[PDB]
C-alpha cells in the first residue's frame, strides 16, 4: 500500500503569515499516463472534509488564490501565502495514481500565541457520589499554552497510570488556549484505603511539574 | 446547486444493519461515481471505496469485505452504504463524496454521518458537584466544576446559571468508560462573586428528557 506521511501533525500559525505544509508518498506518485494524482482537502472542525488542489498543484473552483501546491515524485508541498482564519482546521493529501487511494494522516492549521502555563485545580470525589458507592478525583488543567503537555497522578506518593480519562478541547476562540480534563476514577474502596492524591502537570512553561493534591 | 445531503446518526447495538442515504442534487447523478469515507474520532479519512455510475460496479478496500454493501437509487438520485453485522470497530463518520473521473478525486462532499454501536442502554447522567475541597484558596479567581458521569447515548448539554455564565467555561468532550459516557465542565469566576452570587451547572440529556441543576456549595 501506499503510505501518505503528513508533517507536521500540528502547525502553529499566526494569521495573516505564510503556512507551508509537507506531503510525502512511499511509492512515486507519477502515474504511467504522465498525470501525478495527489490532491489536497480542508476539513473543518464539524464541517465536511473541502476538495482544495486537484492533480498537484490545479486549484479547485472557488478554491482562494493564496493557495499553492507544489512538488513531485514522492514529495509534495501545499503552501499558504497569507493565512486567514477561514483556512483553519486540518489539511489531507490524498493519492489515487496507485491501487486504493490513500490519504495522509492529516496536518492541523492552528493559532500561535505566547506561552501560558496550566491554571491546575484539583476536587477530591463529591460527597453524593462518594455516597452512590463511587469515587473520582478530578483535575482541571485549563488555558495553557502550547498545547504539548502530560498529567501524571500519584496516589500517596506514587504514581497511578491506571483507572485515568483523559479529555482535551480544541483550541479556544477568543485566547488561543488549550485546556485538559483529567479524572482518576477508583473504587470507593481503594479512595477509603488512601490518604493524598495528587495531580502533576508538565508543561513547557516549567522545569518543575505543577503539583495539586490533597489529603483526605 | 451540487448537494449531498445525508441522513441523520445512528445508534445501533452490535450485530444490527444500518443504511446510511446519501441524497444528491443539482448534477447529473448518473454522470458521477459516489465514495464513500469513515473517519473515527479524531482520526484521519480512510476510503471505503466507490461505486461507478454507468457500469455499477463497486469497489471495496480490503478492510470492507464481506459485510457492505454499496447501491443507488438513481430515481431519487440516493446512494446508499449498507453496513451488516455491526462491530464496535463499525463506530466512527462515514462521509459520501461525490467523484469526477477525469482527476480521480472526490469533489463535493456530504456532511458526515456519525455511526455509534453499543449494547448499552439508555441512560441518564449522573451529575456530581466539583467545589474545592479545603485547601490552597486565595487568589483573585476560583475554579468549580460538574461531573456529568454514567450517560448513554451521547451527548449531554451542559451549561452554567442557565447559560448566563460563558466566558469562564470550559466543557470538555465525554469519554467511554465501560458502555458508558462521562464529561466534566469547569467555570472560573472571580473568588468575592463566590458563594455570594450562586454558580449551578443544568445538565440535559435529551436521550432520556433529563435535565438537572447542581448548586455548587462549598464542599
Ligand atoms: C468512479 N470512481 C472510481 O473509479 C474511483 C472514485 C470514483 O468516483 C474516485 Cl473519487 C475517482 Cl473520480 C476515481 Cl477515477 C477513483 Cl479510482 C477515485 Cl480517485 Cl477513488
Known amino acids: 500500500e501506499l503510505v501518505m506521511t503528513q508533517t507536521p501533525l500540528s502547525l502553529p500559525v499566526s494569521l495573516g503569515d505564510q503556512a507551508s505544509i509537507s506531503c510525502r508518498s512511499s511509492?512515486?506518485?507519477?502515474?504511467?499516463?504522465?498525470?501525478?494524482?495527489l490532491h489536497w482537502y480542508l476539513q473543518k472542525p464539524g464541517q465536511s472534509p473541502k476538495f482544495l488542489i486537484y492533480?498537484?498543484?490545479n486549484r479547485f473552483s472557488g478554491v482562494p488564490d493564496r493557495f499553492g501546491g507544489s512538488g513531485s515524485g514522492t514529495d509534495f508541498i501545499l503552501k499558504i501565502s497569507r493565512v486567514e482564519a477561514e483556512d483553519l482546521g486540518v489539511y489531507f493529501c490524498?493519492?489515487?495514481?496507485?491501487?486504493?487511494?490513500?490519504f495522509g494522516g492529516g496536518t492541523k492549521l492552528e493559532i500561535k500565541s505566547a506561552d501560558a502555563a496550566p491554571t491546575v485545580s484539583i476536587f477530591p470525589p463529591s460527597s453524593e457520589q462518594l455516597t452512590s458507592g463511587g469515587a473520582s478525583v478530578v483535575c482541571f488543567l485549563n488555558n495553557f499554552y502550547p498545547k504539548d503537555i502530560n498529567v501524571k497522578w500519584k496516589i500517596d506518593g506514587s504514581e497511578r497510570q491506571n483507572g485515568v480519562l483523559n479529555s482535551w478541547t480544541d483550541q479556544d476562540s477568543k485566547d488561543s488556549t488549550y485546556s485538559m480534563s483529567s479524572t482518576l476514577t477508583l473504587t470507593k474502596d481503594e479512595y477509603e484505603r488512601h490518604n493524598s492524591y495528587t495531580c502533576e502537570a508538565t508543561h513547557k512553561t516549567s522545569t518543575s511539574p505543577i503539583v495539586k493534591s490533597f489529603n483526605r | 446547486q451540487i448537494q449531498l445531503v445525508q441522513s441523520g446518526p445512528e445508534l445501533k447495538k452490535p450485530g444490527e444493519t444500518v443504511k446510511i442515504s446519501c441524497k444528491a442534487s443539482?448534477?447529473?447523478?448518473?454522470?458521477?461515481?459516489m465514495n464513500w469515507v469513515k473517519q473515527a474520532p479524531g482520526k484521519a479519512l480512510k476510503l471505503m471505496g466507490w461505486?461507478?455510475?454507468?457500469?455499477?460496479?463497486?469497489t471495496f478496500a480490503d478492510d470492507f469485505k464481506g459485510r457492505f454493501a454499496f447501491f443507488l437509487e438513481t430515481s431519487a438520485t440516493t446512494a446508499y452504504l449498507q453496513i451488516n453485522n455491526l462491530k464496535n470497530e463499525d463506530m466512527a463518520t462515514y462521509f459520501c463524496?461525490?467523484?469526477?473521473?477525469?482527476?480521480?478525486?472526490?469533489?463535493?462532499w456530504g456532511q458526515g454521518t456519525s455511526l455509534t454501536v453499543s449494547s448499552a442502554k439508555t441512560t441518564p447522567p449522573s451529575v456530581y458537584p466539583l467545589a474545592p475541597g479545603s485547601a490552597a484558596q486565595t487568589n483573585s479567581m476560583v475554579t468549580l466544576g460538574c461531573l456529568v458521569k454514567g450517560y448513554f447515548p451521547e451527548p449531554v448539554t451542559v451549561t452554567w446559571n442557565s447559560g448566563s455564565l460563558s466566558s469562564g467555561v470550559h466543557t470538555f468532550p465525554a469519554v467511554l468508560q465501560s458502555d458508558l459516557y462521562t464529561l466534566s465542565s469547569s467555570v472560573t469566576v472571580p473568588s468575592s462573586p463566590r458563594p455570594s452570587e450562586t454558580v449551578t451547572c443544568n445538565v440535559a440529556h435529551p436521550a432520556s428528557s433529563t435535565k438537572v441543576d447542581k448548586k455548587i456549595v462549598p464542599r
Open positions: 461505486i461507478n455510475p454507468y457500469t455499477g460496479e463497486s
Open positions: 463524496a461525490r467523484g469526477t473521473t477525469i482527476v480521480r478525486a472526490m469533489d463535493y
Open positions: 492533480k498537484v498543484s
Open positions: 511509492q512515486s506518485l507519477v502515474h504511467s499516463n504522465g498525470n501525478t494524482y
Open positions: 443539482g448534477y447529473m447523478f448518473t454522470n458521477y461515481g
Open positions: 490524498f493519492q489515487s495514481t496507485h491501487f486504493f487511494p490513500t
